[PDB]
């Protein structure tokens, strides 16, 4: 079935009047609220709340109001708050009892490529989830190019209840990956001045595992059939596989094994972990999970063999 039966669009080009630009967000969120009141989980996608903020700035300019910062109106944060907090899960008014929600998924166009612009600064004080941009990943064409260091989600704690029911180790593996990425990020910023000569074998494993993560788990094509939509079970299994790679590599190197020899002898399981992303999600959760379990068992066997 077409998505259009689920979707209504609020088209507002840039050449339309500024007041229509300002009212676009409000009419869209009111439609989202109306469909939330029917007990339907409805998602609102705002193309650029930065353009909405610029519309507010232009209107305040025509009104001769005193701006706050970089020309933006003083009530910019108040307006973004009054828009964003129209989102949460709710018990719809009236009877019968029902529950709906409005997931506000609002994009922001940065100014000068930094978070110094007032729109993002006001947004960060409201949004629980902020998927920041990384021009180092964007310029190197590593999509979806989300800045892991500065992006955050305050819904990690709330989602522990969902994870415990479905994927018990998901928060643990997510924290493990974040720790690995941060440690390797500081290791890279040291290396770029010093070099990779003096690092311990464990540091080399951290760097290689984080590079593998960035290239084969975080990076997503989006235009490929195998990876257009990575289901949550596939994502969880991939986190399991990557964390298992890191854990077995660290355990083996702790037992004296040279990292170069281990890497050359386990390039096969490294390629298996890398190509785990190529599994078609359409094959079903059962088949994909079974094949991920096969991959994990193969990795454990291979590392047990090569550690001796």
């Amino acid at each position: 079935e077409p998505i259009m039966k689920r979707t209504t669009l609020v088209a507002n080009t840039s050449n339309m009047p500024v007041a229509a630009r300002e009212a676009s967000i409000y009419t869209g969120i009111t439609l989202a609220e109306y469909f939330r009141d029917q007990g339907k989980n409805v998602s609102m996608i705002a193309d650029s709340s930065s353009r909405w903020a610029e519309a507010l700035r232009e209107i305040s300019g025509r009104l001769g109001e005193m701006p706050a910062d970089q020309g933006f109106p003083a009530y910019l944060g108040a307006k973004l708050a009054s828009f964003y907090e129209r989102a949460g899960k709710a018990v719809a008014l009236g009877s019968p009892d029902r529950t709906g929600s409005v997931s506000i998924v609002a994009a922001v166009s940065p100014a000068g490529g930094d978070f110094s612009d007032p729109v993002t600064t006001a947004t960060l004080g409201i949004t629980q989830v902020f998927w920041g941009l990384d021009k180092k990943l964007a310029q190197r064409k590593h999509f979806p190019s989300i800045n892991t260091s500065v992006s955050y989600s305050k819904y990690t704690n709330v989602l522990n209840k969902f994870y415990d029911s479905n994927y018990p180790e998901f928060p643990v593996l997510r924290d493990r990956m974040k720790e690995i990425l941060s440690n390797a990020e500081e290791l890279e910023q040291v290396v770029q001045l010093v070099g990779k000569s003096a690092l311990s074998d464990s540091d080399k494993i951290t760097l290689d595992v984080a590079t593998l993560i960035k290239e084969d788990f975080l990076q997503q094509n989006g235009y490929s059939t195998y990876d257009a939509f990575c289901p949550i079970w596939k994502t969880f299994d991939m986190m399991r596989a990557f964390i298992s790679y890191h854990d077995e590599a660290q355990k083996a190197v702790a037992n004296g094994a040279n990292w170069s020899k281990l890497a050359d002898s386990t390039g096969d399981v490294k390629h298996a972990v890398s190509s785990s992303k190529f599994f078609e999600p359409s094959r079903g959760e059962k088949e994909v999970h079974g094949e991920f379990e096969k991959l994990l068992s193969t990795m454990q066997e291979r590392f047990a063999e090569s550690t001796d």
Binding site: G112, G113, D114, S116, Q189, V190, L193, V194
Partner: peptide
């Protein structure tokens, strides 16, 4: 402001690299 932050980060990195 973007370039100011960029150069502050560059200065901090160069200072810590100098000490390193």
């Amino acid at each position: 402001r973007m370039t100011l932050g960029l150069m502050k980060t560059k200065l901090k990195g160069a200072n810590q690299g100098y000490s390193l």
